[PDB]
Structure 1
Amino acid sequence: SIVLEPIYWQSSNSKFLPGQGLVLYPQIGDKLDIICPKVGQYEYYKVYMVDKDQADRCTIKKENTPLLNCAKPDQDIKFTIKFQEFSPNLWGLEFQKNKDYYIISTSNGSLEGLDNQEGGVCQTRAMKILMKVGQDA
């Protein structure tokens, strides 16, 4: 049980593969850091957890509430995941073996587009994460 390579949430990251997204195979007990990088120019993001249907349709339902809201460019904002049952998260955010979790953002990257529900960098720049837990290739 170890620390996976950190994932910076931004267009610059190579690990998002066009049409696919970032795909990971963490095992229960592992850590992963998702980071909203601080700063001449800045991207504004609201990062969410969704199921497959919504990840494919690149849409967020109104009830959802984000893991990360990065509206603050002057500071680094970090979300540390350990894959296990219990997290301080309000929804319960549980990680069980042999289950899949999707992380997307529908946002333009512009401050005016931070609250955008549909499309966004999920749809265009392919910012999506698929975490297959307790599984491998």
Structure 2
Amino acid sequence: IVLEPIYWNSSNSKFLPGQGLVLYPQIGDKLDIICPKVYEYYKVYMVDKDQADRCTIKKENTPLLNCAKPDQDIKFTIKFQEFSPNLWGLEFQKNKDYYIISTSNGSLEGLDNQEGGVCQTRAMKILMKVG
């Protein structure tokens, strides 16, 4: 199924303060994460847990969303399966957990802050409970 598009925004009442936005996709679903156009500035990364639970993204880490276009809808589509244009061997599998965050402070000034951010002070972090 095509689940409910998730707007990466400071306003989003789904990012709950203790446990962020948790969602239960099933294999075969597809999910949009969308930064709307005006502006909050974000780089969003699929992390691991520890990185989630510490709000840290390490140099290696390459982003899934570079939200730095004031007047343009920047949108990323995940289909939960083994095949992705992603060339880094990141896929999705049943009964596994995958953590999407940013350490961005939201300004254009703190965009690339690799530590802290709105993950750790707002709970801007998706938990995808797959399967």
- TM-score by shorter chain over 0.5: yes
- TM-superposed CA distance for 1:130, in Å, is 0.7
Once the two structures are superposed, residues 23-53 of structure 1 have per-residue CA deviations (whole angstroms, 9 ceiling, x without a partner) of 01010000110001101xx100000010101
The SS at the match of 1:126 is: coil
TM-score of the two chains, using structure 1 as the length reference: 0.94
What is aligned with 1:19? 18
Once the two structures are superposed, residues 71-91 of structure 1 have per-residue CA deviations (whole angstroms, 9 ceiling, x without a partner) of 111100110111000100121
The SS at the match of 2:51 is: helix
What is aligned with 1:10? 9
Superposed CA RMSD: 0.6
8 Å contact from structure 1 (residues 44, 111) kept in 2: yes
Question: May I ask how many residue pairs the two structures share in their alignment?
Answer: 131
What is aligned with 2:51? 54
Distance 2:35 2:87 in 1: 21
Instruction: Point out where structure 2 has 5 or more consecutive residues left out of the alignment.
Output: none
8 Å contact from structure 1 (residues 107, 120) kept in 2: yes
**Identity of counterpart residues, as a percentage?**
99
- TM-superposed CA distance for 1:60, in Å, is 0.6
- TM-superposed CA distance for 1:92, in Å, is 2.1
8 Å contact from structure 1 (residues 86, 93) kept in 2: no
2:128 is equivalent to residue 131 of structure 1 = yes
Q: Which has the higher helix share?
A: 1
Distance 1:124 1:10 in 2: 14
The SS at the match of 2:75 is: strand
- TM-superposed CA distance for 1:133, in Å, is 0.8
Q: How does 1:1-137 map to 2 (within 5 A)?
A: 2-39=1-38, 42-134=39-131
> Would you identify which runs of 4 or more consecutive aligned residues in structure 1 move more than 3 Å?
none
The SS at the match of 2:109 is: helix
Instruction: Point out where structure 1 has 5 or more consecutive residues left out of the alignment.
Output: none
- TM-superposed CA distance for 1:93, in Å, is 1.8
Distance 1:67 1:91 in 2: 12
- TM-superposed CA distance for 1:106, in Å, is 0.2
The SS at the match of 1:111 is: coil
